[PDB]
Design a protein around this ligand. Structure first.
Ligand code: FE
Ligand code: FE
Ligand code: FE
Ligand code: FE
Lengths: 155, 155
């Protein structure tokens, strides 16, 4: 019914890619956390991978509605941590860069008056910023407490 | 309780990577098929992504049990098709190469007498070969019938 802007489509595909990587990374990390007996951390990672799945859905829906083609695009490795701090750091690196990409896209969607795409991305960004926030606190505590002291209060 | 062979672990991580890519690709393709009104094709792609998820689980379980670390490793783009034939071809390219990697790994697991890893991979290979087979038939029919004639008998 309506072919959308092609740079918007190109942005949506870039963001979709970000989500797929986030999905795979939190799936792995969640399983590693669980293997260690860190219920709380596994719980949040697991639910996060579910959310990112949901974002990915929204993105694909939107590309298809705009008569665009899903088109990844080199996702890019992929930094599975070897300890909790490392894992959370890679996660936060992924999230921050994702948020950036979202902010640029939202800008461009608005310039070209794709308010539907813009508003969808804004809703998603809000989600991103909450997890970013959560992540920055955990890493703060590991810093302040020390990784071992931090873990043991999880257990 | 038991640190496993490190080349086996390295192989398991390579195969895990293959699964993650397969998961992301069939998730996308399944959604594209569905957007076109191809219930049967979407149904099989969707269920396939579920299976590959299950393989990924088995792999991560096994790496963790062998005191190995999940470690991807450049997944590699990623070839989303633009029509059904193209999509199925990319899928089959992915599957065949995956099967190959499995066969090498199974060989090596057996040489070093990791029968548990070997047997797990054999079970997985059997799954791979069935979908490969299914895929080779669909592509045969598209060839014999022509893509349009093929589709319309789906609908
Ligand atoms: Fe997201
Ligand atoms: Fe997020
Ligand atoms: Fe598989
Ligand atoms: Fe398969």
């Amino acid at each position: 019914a309506m072919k959308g802007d092609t740079k918007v489509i190109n942005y949506l595909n870039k963001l979709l890619g970000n989500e797929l990587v986030a999905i795979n990374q939190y799936f792995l990390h969640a399983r590693m956390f669980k293997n260690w007996g860190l219920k709380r951390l596994n719980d949040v990672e697991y639910r996060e991978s579910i959310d990112e799945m949901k974002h990915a859905d929204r993105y694909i829906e939107r590309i298809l509605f705009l008569e665009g083609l899903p088109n990844l695009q080199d996702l890019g490795k992929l930094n599975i941590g070897e300890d909790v701090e490392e894992m959370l750091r890679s996660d936060l690196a992924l999230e921050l860069d994702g948020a950036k990409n979202l902010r640029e896209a939202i800008g461009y969607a608005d310039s070209v008056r794709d308010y539907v795409s813009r508003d969808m991305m804004i809703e998603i960004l809000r989600d991103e910023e909450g997890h970013i926030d959560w992540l920055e606190t955990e890493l703060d505590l590991i810093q302040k407490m020390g990784l071992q002291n931090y873990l043991q209060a999880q257990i």
